[PDB]
Amino acid sequence: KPSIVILGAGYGGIVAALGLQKRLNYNEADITLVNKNDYHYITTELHQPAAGTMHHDQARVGIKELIDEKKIKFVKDTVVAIDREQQKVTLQNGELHYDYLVVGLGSEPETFGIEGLREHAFSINSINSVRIIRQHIEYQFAKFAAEPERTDYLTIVVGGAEFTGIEFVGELADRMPELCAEYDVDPKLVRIINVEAAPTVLPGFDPALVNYAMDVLGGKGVEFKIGTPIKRCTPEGVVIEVDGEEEEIKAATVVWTGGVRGNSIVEKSGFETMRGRIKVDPYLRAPGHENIFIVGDCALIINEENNRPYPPTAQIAIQHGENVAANLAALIRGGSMTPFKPHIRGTVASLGRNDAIGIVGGRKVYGHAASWLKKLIDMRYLYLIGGLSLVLKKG
Amino acid sequence: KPSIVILGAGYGGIVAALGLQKRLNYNEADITLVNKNDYHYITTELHQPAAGTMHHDQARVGIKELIDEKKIKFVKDTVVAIDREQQKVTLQNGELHYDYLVVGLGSEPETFGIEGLREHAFSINSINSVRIIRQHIEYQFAKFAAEPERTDYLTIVVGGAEFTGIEFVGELADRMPELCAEYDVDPKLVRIINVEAAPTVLPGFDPALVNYAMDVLGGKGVEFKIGTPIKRCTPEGVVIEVDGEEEEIKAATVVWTGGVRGNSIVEKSGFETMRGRIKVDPYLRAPGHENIFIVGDCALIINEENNRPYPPTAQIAIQHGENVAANLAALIRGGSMTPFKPHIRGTVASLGRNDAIGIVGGRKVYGHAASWLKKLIDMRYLYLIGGLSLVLKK
Ligand SMILES: Cc1cc2nc3c(=O)[nH]c(=O)nc-3n(C[C@H](O)[C@H](O)[C@H](O)COP(=O)(O)OP(=O)(O)OC[C@H]3O[C@@H](n4cnc5c(N)ncnc54)[C@H](O)[C@@H]3O)c2cc1C
Ligand SMILES: Cc1cc2nc3c(=O)[nH]c(=O)nc-3n(C[C@H](O)[C@H](O)[C@H](O)COP(=O)(O)OP(=O)(O)OC[C@H]3O[C@@H](n4cnc5c(N)ncnc54)[C@H](O)[C@@H]3O)c2cc1C
């Protein structure tokens, strides 16, 4: 038999595994799915638990429930490195050998060599992380009542005004009243600050949506510093440059949404990467390797319409997964492989549980309609991986 | 005038103010009650929020509801100092003058000058404090899944196996399943440690009850280090001396139930204090001062029947309150006042929602019945201070 190894159980990994599961009958191939955890988590919702608006359990599902144990063998371990030449993968407590390999380890934060960011800041990239963020913030608010001289406890800074950062501050803003009610804090003293290097909030968005969003969040007490870059980060706070002069913000909680790069494991294993990602062939496989397929954030692709790269998104990762499943199933059988054609719909961004901005159907949706739309789109994924039972289990 | 000032709205203080209000007709005297916070909190329940077993809002009640504006005037500020000679009290945002004074600012943690205890440890003495403790523990558990190498995060050390410490570890133990369930932590790796200098846990109680309690908590995964004293404290953990050698415990959370002393203001105000507390006359009044009365944890008293001192407790503080109310009313009226004789009921200690130990009525009650007994006794105070509305609201 031929042995297929899939790394990571993220969007690309899980869609690939489930697809392979559907395509192949028993004994056609040996399939192993490797993930750091026994669960796969819905990354797109991760902002919600981080704020504390939603329980983290909604964002994750157990892998054992998702798959057939006869078809796939599941491994709970951490990837340390990949060796192409030896054709083996090295894990913390194991090693594997693959006839065919699928790589979807997701992304790692991009700090752009900003001083102290990696050490002293938080990121929304996992269940553990959002848990830590949420309880961190709750802890500081708990601490405020003891010494109210220290208003830094109430200050929360988000780095980057890109998609993730804006969703997160929206959730935080919606979260704030209940939190202050819990910890006996005057709502006025709380500061939520969004700091972006770029001159505009939400680049890659129609200005109409952006200003509407700024009206909503600004109405909710959010503060925006734009054209302002983070000079450095310290346990005390952050230091930013305005009008070519240094200014210091003393904040207990600093969260970094500014940028993302591919997993370090990919670059560290001798691949060549632009921004940590690999520019793959029309069949989504690494250049010079017929036996390795790449998906999600680790993969790089460019649009025909403009010589600019497709952004790293859940949706494109899903498409990657289905395509790779099809191609692998065909390839082991000696069949013809299909090239990858990306079909891209529009994305909706939440401004809290009740509010959103989006471009869907080439239309400019706002408010409740946009929010409900986003929820429906997200439900479509749940239907995809787990079906009616999975969707019903949420709500 | 005559002007009466009460400091703090703890058990003694609030019972005192309520007592005066019940006792006196309108316009008879000027009474002002001062507290750092707009609420009075049921200290007796404070261990529960610290574990996270019970929401904190239950443990506190707003003061304004309790008293009648016209009878009493409330000031929300923090006492900074007392000047006996000038007969004045100094606050952060005010100053007050008293014909008669009542002091019940409660207690402050006693660390016995142990290195780093005040800096690096937690105490269960206020709502804010228990909130900080609870969220601290939750924070460590949240941190754990990211790095499971660090088991110190899961370790919680409690100093003292006295009444408070035992209740607290009991609550933590009952708390543990839900807590471990939330943050993806194996229940086994969790350590709860109770550390006492004394050779026995829970001194001053009949040994049978003690053995039963150790059986319960020990069954619940609680660990006891007895005859072992804490040498010093670090943010990483604590250092204790066992078998004539230093031993290092790596624990993220250290909670101190070991000792209590009177409020620092008392020592700082020119009083003469044994353990930061004052030894009062039979009328519950400060020595050398006819216009000053002391209540609660700030007060010190001795039993004739046994040459041992009365401990600082809620119930005795309440008795202080009623006594001071009656005596004060007499003093304003010019009548003869009653000396203070304390009558003591039995005390019950919880081991969680499902278990308790008590010596109420000399029956030495154990288990579930004891728990219900404690709940009823706790309800009695609520009935006293607020009436039907307060008890129903819980
Ligand atoms: C708040 C937030 C909101 C978002 N909303 C949207 C949206 O609305 N629409 C949209 O299209 N996109 C959205 N995205 C982007 C989208 O979520 C990501 O692009 C997508 O998750 C990436 O797909 P992936 O499977 O390759 O990465 P991942 O989902 O991160 O896959 C990583 C998986 O592999 C595991 N893993 C990682 N490293 C290792 C390792 N060394 N060893 C073993 N296992 C490892 C991880 O535990 C995880 O299981 C959002 C992102 C964020 C942070
Ligand atoms: C976990 C715990 C459990 C307990 N369980 C029991 C039990 O089961 N049975 C029993 O009999 N006793 C029990 N006790 C003891 C009892 O709760 C205390 O002894 C009681 O508080 C004594 O009355 P107090 O008014 O002096 O204390 P406090 O209630 O603490 O009075 C202090 C009040 O004054 C305020 N204050 C303090 N300093 C200032 C300042 N400078 N300026 C203005 N305001 C100030 C405080 O905020 C507080 O409101 C327990 C104590 C603890 C910590």
Numbering used by the authors:
A (entry chain B): 3 to 397
B (entry chain A): 3 to 396
Question: Can you list sentences taken from the study reporting this PDB entry?
Answer:
NDH-2 is also much smaller and simpler in structure than complex I – it comprises only a single subunit and one flavin redox cofactor.
To test the proposal that the two substrate reactions are independent of each other we mutated a key residue in each substrate-binding site. G164 is positioned next to the adenine-proximal ribose of the bound nucleotide and I379 is positioned at the entry to the quinone-binding pocket. G164E crystallized in a different space group (P41212) to the wild-type (WT) protein, but the glutamate side chain could be observed confidently in only one of two molecules in the asymmetric unit. In comparison with WT, G164E and I379E exhibit RMSD values of 0.54 Å (Cα of 395 residues) and 0.45 Å (Cα of 393 residues), respectively, with no substantial additional differences. For the G164E variant the KM for NADH increases drastically to more than 1 mM, consistent with the mutation compromising NADH binding. Furthermore, the observed rates drop drastically (only ~1% of the WT activity is observed in even 600 μM NADH), and, as a consequence, the apparent KM value for menadione decreases significantly because the turnover rate is ‘capped’ by the slow rate of NADH oxidation. Subsequent additions of NAD+ to the reduced protein also failed to produce a CTC. Figure 6C shows that the reaction between G164E and NADH is very slow (~0.2 s−1 in 2 μM NADH), similar to the reaction of the WT with NADPH (~0.3 s−1 in 2 μM NADPH), consistent with weak nucleotide binding. Conversely, when NADH-reduced G164E was reacted with menadione rapid oxidation of the flavin (~175 s−1 in 1.5 μM menadione, matching the ~200 s−1 rate for WT) was observed, demonstrating that the quinone-binding site is fully functional, irrespective of the functionality of the NADH-binding site.
